[PDB]
Amino acid sequence: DIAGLTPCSESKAYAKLEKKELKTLEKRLKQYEADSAPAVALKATMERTKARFANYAKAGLLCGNDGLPHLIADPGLALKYGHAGEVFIPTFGFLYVAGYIGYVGRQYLIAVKGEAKPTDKEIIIDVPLATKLAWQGAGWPLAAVQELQRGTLLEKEENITVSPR
Amino acid sequence: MKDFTTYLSTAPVIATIWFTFTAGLLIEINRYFPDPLVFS
Amino acid sequence: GDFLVHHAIALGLHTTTLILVKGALDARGSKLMPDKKDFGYSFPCDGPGRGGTCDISAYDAFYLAVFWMLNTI
Amino acid sequence: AKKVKIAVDRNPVETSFEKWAKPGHFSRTLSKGPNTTTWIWNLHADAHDFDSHTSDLEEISRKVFSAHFGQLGIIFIWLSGMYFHGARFSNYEAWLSDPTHIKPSAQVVWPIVGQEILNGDVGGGFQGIQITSGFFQLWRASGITSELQLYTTAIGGLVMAAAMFFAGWFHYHKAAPKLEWFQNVESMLNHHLGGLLGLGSLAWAGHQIHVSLPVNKLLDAGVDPKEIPLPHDLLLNRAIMADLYPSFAKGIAPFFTLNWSEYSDFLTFKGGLNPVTGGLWLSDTAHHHVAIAVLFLVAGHMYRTNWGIGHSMKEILEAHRGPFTGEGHVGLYEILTTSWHAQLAINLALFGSLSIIVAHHMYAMPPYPYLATDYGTQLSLFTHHTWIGGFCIVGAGAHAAIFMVRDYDPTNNYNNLLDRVIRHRDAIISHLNWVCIFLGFHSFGLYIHNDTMSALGRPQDMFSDTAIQLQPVFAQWIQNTHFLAPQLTAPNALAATSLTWGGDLVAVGGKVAMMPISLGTSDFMVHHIHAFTIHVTVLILLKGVLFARSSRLIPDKANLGFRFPCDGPGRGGTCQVSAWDHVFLGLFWMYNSLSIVIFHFSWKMQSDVWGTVTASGVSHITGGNFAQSANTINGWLRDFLWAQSSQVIQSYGSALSAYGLIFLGAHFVWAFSLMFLFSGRGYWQELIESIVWAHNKLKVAPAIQPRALSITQGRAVGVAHYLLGGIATTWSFFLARIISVG
Amino acid sequence: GMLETPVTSAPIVATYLSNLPAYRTGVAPVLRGVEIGLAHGFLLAGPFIKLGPLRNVPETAEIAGSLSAAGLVLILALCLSIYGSAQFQSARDPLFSADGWSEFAAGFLVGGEAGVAWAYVCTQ
Amino acid sequence: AHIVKIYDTCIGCTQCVRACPLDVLEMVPWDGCKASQMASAPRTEDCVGCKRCETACPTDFLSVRVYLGSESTRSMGLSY
Amino acid sequence: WTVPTLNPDTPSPIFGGSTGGLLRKAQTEEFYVITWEAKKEQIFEMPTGGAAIMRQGPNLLKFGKKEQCLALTTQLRNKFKLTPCFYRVFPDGKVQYLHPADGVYPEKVNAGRVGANQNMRRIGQNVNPIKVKFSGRMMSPAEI
Ligand code: CLA
Ligand code: CLA
Ligand code: CLA
Ligand code: CLA
Ligand code: CLA
Ligand code: CLA
Ligand SMILES: CC1=C(C/C=C(\C)CCC[C@H](C)CCC[C@H](C)CCCC(C)C)C(=O)c2ccccc2C1=O
Ligand code: SF4
Ligand code: SF4
Ligand code: SF4
């Protein structure tokens, strides 16, 4: 398979790893009674463990010789072989949220610079104003492009202080 | 009351509330969707 | 395992370059010390004024960079 | 003569949230609001520096008094939480039945992101984090047997916490004492000696006689905890007590007729340790607290208040003058009734020293049942109370220096002791400098000698028990005297105060509780390392105090204040001349000294005291390897650090894995601190300029101008992260090691 | 101006210091070095003999210990020589002069080596 | 000795002279500023290089500048 | 106004002494003398540590470096409203009057003073270091 890896569903090491993890919990479960709270907690952990190994194999992760899932980061390989949900799709999930936070903060900063005392709005947050901007940040990718195309995203060099050179 | 709600709008208090909320949201998602490593 | 350590090495190269490059390009002056070139490559500081100016010389930037070079190597 | 009386002001400060919404209100400099990020840091650094906000001593005193109620309120919440978690999230009831085979636990983690592995199998049908604070052993000693009793204490703690916070509000906003009230030092000492300490000890002795002793007597007899009479039944039924202690059949008549020998059944002088629990006899502690109560109630009648009798502290000081010291103690009464910093300097110095004494006395004479054989608790308590003492002692140096800069006044100190100490400060510091060099060469140099000889294959040339010997004969002589005390110099004591002096070991649950501690060459060498490290810490701190106001380098240091970065690159460079900077350097040396103290304690106890007892004898945890290995640096690196770090670095996948993570996390924080200690703000401010340019380019530059930390804050951040990382590293290392092999 | 103490200003202390060859003016610098040399050379053999690498050898210990002390006297004499060269280049006491110090250093060598030899004779 | 220079941006506020711990600076008559006085550095053999004068100067950039130079007993601040 | 002449006979403030005073430098290189007239007996702080009492009338103290004399001058001027002066005294007996140099304290502009080390340009108008290279020694562009 990709880069000599093998699917985790077909990996002997992957299957062996699950047995060891469950075996460790089973050993601890012997010293407790069937209905006792420690027994219930240990079995709940065992159910989660079995579900975890079942889900990762179902998702089609590739496993190395160690039996551990390995992620695929090249967009071409990820999209060609159905690994887009490992790095590629998460990539755009992050950039949407990260830009959301950045864009909302930038809007608040610009909004309060027109006030009488801008610095007072940075240590005592204008929560009504902050809340309104938070909800409107869901469309930042559209808003950001329009500023880029309108020439208003960036400031002109003549207004930026620099040191002597 | 105006002054007290002004106090609750200071940076440390807002940060406490916002991070308590953000942490709660992330913890509760992992409670109902445990061990997420990939998107399916 | 090779993936993670190679990005550690890139972190070291870029941070060491940042300190050395910043030292070179600010060697002649900065907003904090506009006339730095009048004081030479190596000098103690410019005193506690203007907020405090410890390790402001280009020589001190090199001194900081050596720690990062050792960490990177 | 001024009458000692209550004096307050009605409604001095209105209770309002107006100032909560005005950050920096307390200071004239900061009340105008931020223009740079330095304002934000300055807000917090000056928050509790009350005397820098005003010169009125009455206003300062009132803030101090109510801040103290706030501290007490927080402590009551903390105590209430400990009792509550013992009532609701512990295995205390199960532990009471089988104290040796169950590990105390009072913290349970939620199952989330896989962290429930930290709920280890600690026994008693329970899962949780194993605690080392020793609360279980404290609770058993006081006679607590059920979760209900723990729960009720937690509720009462919250009621006290609310009362403390009410008192703080009440005594600042409603009835604030006047300055004359605070200055009744004679009355305060009478009440704090006779009342706080005397009555407190008497009351606790009352609890021990009526609750602790009867309950612990039945527990040590194998009686089941649930079959033991409830404490109020013991109080109301003299017949039940008379069964346990026959002298109770005579009531309180023997006390009032001076037939005190009747109470020998519960007021004893046994000494040694209870062979069942491995702790001190509770009948000995009860007699101790009775005797202490009488002593402090007598002490509380020494000072004159309102009825002629008693001493004037001012008259005592002024009388004690001699030929060699000029005016002597004149002016000290005025200093100590007008400067909080002077008072805090003395109180921190001894409170910190007291903490270190507690660390030594509790390991050697374990006062709680089943404490001695809980090696995890023994190591933790000693380490904890040693560190508190060290930190407190450094604070004494800091606030002595603050008094020197802010409160010292030459007009009131002419040719008295304080004035004369200043006038030969060069003689004091120069000699102390020489002693440190002598101690450094002849203590650490011995290790270097030993490492070199061992590396060259000349073990016969080493300082060791099998070679050139350095016996601590003075310490050995003292041990023998204390072991023989019951025969001659303490005739009424059955046994010596501690088993460390000599004699036979006490084993509880197949493990050594305490046994004699032998002192060889390795012990001689490490004690003179302790002498070296303490003397240097004193040197740094004392120098900062004596030169706080001036020196040959900076003739007017007093005008520059307690805390300033330097006085410029001139005179060859004057970085870190201020007194604050001496506290900064003193912290590092305090950390260096107490690290060796606790490493000494950890290795010595594992090697020569702690261990398992069987038919073949006593096998110590590290097999007695301290004597021959602890005399070389390589011995400490190999046999202590490398060997004993095995537990912590192998804890991943177990309940102790949290200590493995913190072990690495603490190494990180320590190394992170070197960034602040090695560099200077001038570099960082110039870096921030470029980053600001990028934010300007994108119209996202903040209105509060970013600034690099001040020079002094860079040092404060550096040392704070250094200490936290260094201490937290050893914390993880100790707990993972001792909870695993203990 | 200066702080006067019994240690700094006492009659017994002052009289003792004046008697020492270092402070005994009116004596030839060479004689001063010999007296100072003898005193220091004699004591120097002690630690080397009792704590050297050959201390446990029955008879070699005395020779090695005193022989090493003699080597230290030579090093010390060289230190005195160069000190005079540096300190005095361009007054009441002849000792503090270019010629006087050189004579004083020479006396220290002769006295020091003799003191080491005398110590060896006492041992054996 | 250190090198101290006064530049024509001085406003004659006198704060550098008041702050000098060595009495290196003094005020002299001038006509280039409203105060009609300018700072002067007549005795630079006594300058220790502390730069308290630079800390006190209000103008932007500084009107009094210290360049650390050769070290003597005076400039080093030694009392021995 | 004329340069005062030092009077060695002047009494000194009452002071028991300390270890922070003069060293061998005073005997071989130079020391400093400060004198002032006191309106009354009063306690002041010595720059070398400790408290001393100034005698009513003339006072005289000796210090090891110039900064010590000026540090006491600042204290006396600001806290007691006095007018001290000090000298530099050489081992051969020569006396050099120092402060105030012309009888008027430097912070007050006085006629007859000649500007020194005054550049008739801004800091930003200094030349680049390359223009003063190989001038015979190390020198800043601010030295031209
Ligand atoms: C960070 C740099 C980087 C690197 C080193 C690679 C490397 C690689 N990519 Mg990837 N790729 C990247 C970024 C990168 N990619 C990005 C940012 C995108 C999104 C725009 C893609 C989109 C992409 C696609 C769509 C494909 C690859 C493919 C490949 C592999 C073979 C083609 C090749 O010669 O690529 C060397 C890379 C470069 C010279 C840089 C530009 C590469 C472009 C974007 C793709 C070229 C595809 C190529 C013409 C396909 C030929 C047929 C194929 C069957 C071999 C190779 C391992 C191919 C593959 O093996 O898919 C399974 C493939 O089909 N990549
Ligand atoms: C609800 C009642 C109330 C109100 C409205 C006020 C109002 C006022 N008080 Mg008063 N006070 C109160 C209760 C109250 N006080 C109590 C209970 C006490 C006893 C402690 C005091 C003691 C007191 C003093 C000694 C002083 C005031 C002062 C003030 C003024 C400024 C307050 C300020 O800036 O607070 C903002 C401050 C905070 C929010 C800090 C809170 C600190 C507490 C102790 C909790 C800290 C706990 C926390 C967990 C610590 C660890 C943190 C860690 C986990 C990160 C203002 C008029 C000051 C003044 O200038 O008066 C003229 C002043 O000097 N008060
Ligand atoms: C017998 C009387 C008595 C007692 C028991 C105390 C006890 C205490 N005083 Mg002292 N004090 C007294 C008389 C007394 N004082 C007198 C007469 C004066 C005036 C000269 C002072 C002036 C004074 C000051 C200025 C300060 C103290 C402080 C303290 C506390 C030190 C910390 C400690 O050990 O906590 C141990 C804690 C406990 C044992 C908890 C005990 C709680 C209960 C309610 C008893 C508190 C004592 C109180 C006088 C009871 C009546 C109060 C009121 C309802 C009438 C402590 C609670 C310091 C402090 O922290 O104040 C807040 C402090 O700053 N005291
Ligand atoms: C502070 C510590 C303390 C306290 C509180 C107690 C308390 C007690 N001891 Mg103990 N004891 C102590 C220290 C203490 N002891 C010490 C140090 C020793 C060693 C010398 C002893 C040795 C000892 C012995 C040998 C005995 C006791 C006994 C007792 C009990 C009876 C005492 C008695 O006869 O009182 C006599 C009377 C009083 C104390 C006065 C009571 C006044 C009341 C409270 C006034 C209420 C007035 C009010 C208006 C009422 C309003 C009502 C409302 C509903 C309207 C009692 C529970 C006896 C017992 O039976 O123990 C089980 C007993 O035999 N003790
Ligand atoms: C009874 C104890 C006591 C008291 C009442 C005080 C009181 C005071 N001290 Mg003193 N001090 C003490 C002990 C004490 N000190 C000790 C033990 C030391 C040695 C370390 C010092 C060293 C010291 C110095 C060097 C200075 C003071 C200063 C002050 C004053 C201002 C404090 C302030 O504003 O803090 C504001 C509080 C903070 C900024 C918070 C600091 C938090 C630290 C850095 C980290 C805590 C980490 C935490 C425990 C664990 C990690 C948590 C994290 C992971 C979240 C005030 C009068 C200052 C002054 O100028 O006084 C005139 C000053 O400069 N103290
Ligand atoms: C391992 C690191 C280290 C070492 C070796 C030292 C050494 C010293 N420190 Mg320092 N210090 C350190 C770290 C260290 N420090 C750090 C990290 C800090 C920052 C917090 C400081 C902060 C600090 C302060 C603030 C002070 C010291 C002081 C001292 C001195 C104590 C007196 C003494 O023992 O002298 C004897 C020297 C030693 C014990 C060092 C080893 C000596 C070897 C074994 C001798 C070898 C001899 C041999 C003939 C060599 C020949 C070589 C060749 C020519 C052939 C000493 C010079 C104190 C001082 O100066 O006291 C007077 C003092 O005030 N230190
Ligand atoms: C690293 C370093 C800096 C740079 C460090 C800085 C500027 C401190 C940075 C602190 C935080 C991270 C920045 C401010 C954070 C805000 C409160 C916003 C937080 C936002 C979150 C809540 C999301 C110095 O300024 C310095 C000064 C003197 C000696 C050494 C050093 C030094 O080593
Ligand atoms: S602390 Fe900083 S500014 Fe002050 S002299 Fe030292 S290096 Fe210069
Ligand atoms: S550097 Fe110091 S001594 Fe020199 S002129 Fe400036 S303030 Fe005066
Ligand atoms: S402080 Fe600056 S502006 Fe003021 S007189 Fe001095 S050089 Fe001129």
Residue numbers in the entry:
A (entry chain F): 63 to 227
B (entry chain J): 1 to 40
C (entry chain B): 516 to 588
D (entry chain A): 10 to 751
E (entry chain L): 53 to 142, 157 to 190
F (entry chain C): 2 to 81
G (entry chain D): 53 to 196
What did the study's authors say about this model?
Photosystem I (PSI) enables photo-electron transfer and regulates photosynthesis in the bioenergetic membranes of cyanobacteria and chloroplasts. Being a multi-subunit complex, its macromolecular organization affects the dynamics of photosynthetic membranes. A chloroplast photosystem I (PSI) of green algae consists of a core complex and three antenna modules: inner belt, outer belt and Lhca2-Lhca9 heterodimer, which together comprise 24 subunits.
The remaining 74,209 particles containing the monomer were refined to 2.31 Å resolution, representing a considerable improvement on the previously reported maps. In our PSI monomer reconstruction, the resolution in the core is ~2.1 Å, and in the LHCI inner belt 2.1–2.5 Å, revealing additional structural details of chlorophylls, carotenoids and 621 water molecules. The quality of the data aided in improving the previous models in functionally important regions. This includes the identification of nine Chl b molecules, two newly modelled luteins, a β-carotene and more accurate estimation of the coordination of 53 chlorophylls. Particularly, Chl b molecules are identified at positions 601 and 606 in Lhca4, Lhca5, Lhca6, Lhca7 and Lhca8. The two newly modelled luteins 720 and 626 are in the N-terminus of Lhca3 next to Chl a 614, and in Lhca5 next to Chl a 617, respectively. Another striking feature of the high-resolution cryo-EM map is resolvable density for multiple newly detected water molecules, which particularly aided in modelling the coordination of chlorophylls. Remarkably, water molecules play a coordinative role for most of Chl b, for which the relative ratio of water coordination is four times higher than for Chl a. The difference between Chl a and Chl b is a methyl versus a formyl group; thus, water serves as a hydrogen bond donor to the latter, while it also interacts with charged/polar protein residues or lipids. Therefore, the immediate surrounding of Chl b molecules is more enriched with non-protein material than previously thought, which plays a role in tuning the photophysics and the transport properties of excitation energy in PSI.
